[PDB]
């Protein structure tokens, strides 16, 4: 188990760690998070009590370095930093632990939620979507735009998701216009899977990362990307049987985790009704359809 120590907590803030969250009061004796499960990416995120504008946070993998959080009073935010002095780091963490100044990552032994939400998400692929090569962790916030959104403004600060556009020359073969527009299998299987992503795991990793940024930061472009990647699969008549079964599981856990009170802003009614009831795969997502119909029947 790994640790993300905090230098201090000078401003009141709601801190998230993966799907958990807790409140820290201004100048409260808080020195970070311990018992973080090894083997998964994680996200530590922030919403200031005095300014809920800008949710922001950091994707990281404790196997790739020793990371800590320090508030910057000039730029006004909690920043992730890497400590290269390993002995210093272990010594600091141990002190904070002995003084019990850290919250414990509160994982229930039965619970595979975080694994099921991040199964295909890898830090190496996050760092290609979020470009800041000098750090081993990746900053994301609520306002960052995607490359596609910028085609329709700073490029150093963009989310470089894979552009999906159903009315593009990439999506449509000259001479197969009706075929390719009504059946997206070419775009999915040849352009996206064989051509760009190479395998379905990388595709699912980007889909899962987009959902998590939509949920944790309210990042609108990430929500657009998540729905686009679902619709591309559901609108293809030819999808490998293992991809459909895995998608059903991926979506089930996403819908299960979504806050009920954010359902109105995070779920696109058109996309979900098309996918579950009209698309080629309308009958292939049994688990997802069941949780959607029992949890969010209004949307449908």
């Amino acid at each position: 188990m790994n640790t993300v120590p905090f230098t201090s907590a000078p401003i009141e803030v709601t801190i998230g760690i993966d799907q958990y969250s807790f409140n820290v009061k201004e100048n409260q004796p808080f020195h970070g998070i311990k018992d973080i499960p090894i083997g998964h990416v994680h996200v530590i995120h922030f919403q200031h009590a005095d300014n809920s504008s800008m949710r922001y946070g950091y994707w990281f993998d404790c196997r790739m370095g020793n990371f800590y959080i320090q508030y910057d009073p000039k730029d006004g935010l909690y920043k992730m930093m890497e400590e290269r002095d390993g002995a210093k780091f272990e010594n600091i963490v141990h002190n904070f632990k002995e003084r019990q100044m850290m919250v414990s990552y509160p994982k229930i032994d039965e619970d595979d939620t975080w694994y099921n939400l991040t199964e295909f998400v890898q830090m190496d692929k996050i760092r290609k979507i979020v470009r800041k090569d000098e750090n081993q962790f990746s900053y994301v916030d609520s306002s960052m735009t995607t490359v596609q959104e910028n085609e329709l403004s700073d490029p150093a600060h963009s989310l470089n998701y894979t552009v999906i556009n159903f009315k593009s020359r990439e999506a449509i073969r000259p001479g197969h216009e009706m075929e390719d527009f009504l059946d997206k299998s070419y775009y999915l299987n040849t352009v996206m899977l064989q051509g760009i992503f190479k395998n379905s795991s990388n595709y699912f990793g980007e889909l899962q990362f987009a959902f998590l940024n939509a949920m944790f930061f309210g990042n609108y472009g990430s929500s657009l990307q998540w729905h686009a990647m679902i619709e591309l699969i559901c609108s293809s008549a030819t999808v490998p049987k293992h991809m459909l079964d895995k998608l059903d599981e991926i979506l089930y856990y996403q819908i299960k985790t979504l806050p009920e009170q954010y359902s109105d802003i995070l779920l696109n009614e058109r996309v979900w009704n098309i996918c579950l009831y009209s698309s080629f795969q309308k009958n292939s997502l049994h688990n997802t359809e069941k949780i959607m119909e029992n949890k969010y029947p209004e949307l449908l």
């Binding site: 009315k167 593009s168 020359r169 449509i172 000259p174 216009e177 009706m178 527009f181």
Partner: protein
């Protein structure tokens, strides 16, 4: 965006454009089978492509053989329309390519947009106008060329004949739409009005008789009376 009553004079500016109507592409007769089921028999159709400024009607004739062995023909017909419109644009030089194509039915937007991806600078637009172009098959020489076709073919008619010598294209389009609305509402009476007088005889090269300016005023009035008459008959007014 969409085309309506406010920006209506845009139709007659110098930016080359076409109206595309697909309502006569896929045409069927419905009949009973010997077993008492219902089946369809396709008949030849056409794509109505009109330059409203010049009056040229580029009619593609859609021969029934294009439907042989195909499924979901009402959907295919929209994509076949878009395919043929794209092919006419592709055939033309850069200085004859239309800056806008206005579809009379919104269901043609995506098919045409997709076929025209190679032409990002050509705007594909719907219209709020209810245009009576479906009645183009009430014009005898157009209906004849379509029904006699044994193969795909695209035939030029001039739907304003020589009117442009005497009137503006705004006025010509208004006359055309009144004539087509009347033929749509009561085809027999409209043709009766148009042909009653055997002495102003619709010339061999013409669709519309060779009416004088004064006679067109009279014809146009009689067509309005027919439309008003049929409206009263329909709604018991």
């Amino acid at each position: 965006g969409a085309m309506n009553s406010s920006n209506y004079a845009e139709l007659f500016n110098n930016d080359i454009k076409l109206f595309v109507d697909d309502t006569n592409v896929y045409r069927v007769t419905v009949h009973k089978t010997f077993e008492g089921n219902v089946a369809t028999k396709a008949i030849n159709g056409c794509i109505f492509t009109l330059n409203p400024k010049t009056g040229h009607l580029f009619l593609k004739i859609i021969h029934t053989s294009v439907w042989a062995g195909q499924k979901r023909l009402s959907q295919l017909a929209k994509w076949k329309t878009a395919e043929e419109v794209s092919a006419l644009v592709r055939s033309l030089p850069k200085e004859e390519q239309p800056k806008q194509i206005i579809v009379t039915r919104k269901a043609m937007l995506d098919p045409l947009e997709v076929h025209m991806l190679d032409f990002p600078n050509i705007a594909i637009r719907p219209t709020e106008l209810r245009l009576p172009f479906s009645a183009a098959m009430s014009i005898d020489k157009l209906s004849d060329v379509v029904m006699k076709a044994t193969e795909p073919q695209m035939v030029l008619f001039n739907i304003y004949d020589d009117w442009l010598d005497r009137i503006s294209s705004y006025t010509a389009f208004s006359r055309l739409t009144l004539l087509l609305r009347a033929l749509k509402t009561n085809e027999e009476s409209a043709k009766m009005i148009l042909l009653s007088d055997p002495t102003i005889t619709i010339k061999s090269y013409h669709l519309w008789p060779s009416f004088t300016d004064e006679q067109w005023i009279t014809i146009e009035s009689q067509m309005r009376d027919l439309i008003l008459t049929e409206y009263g008959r329909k709604y018991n007014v």
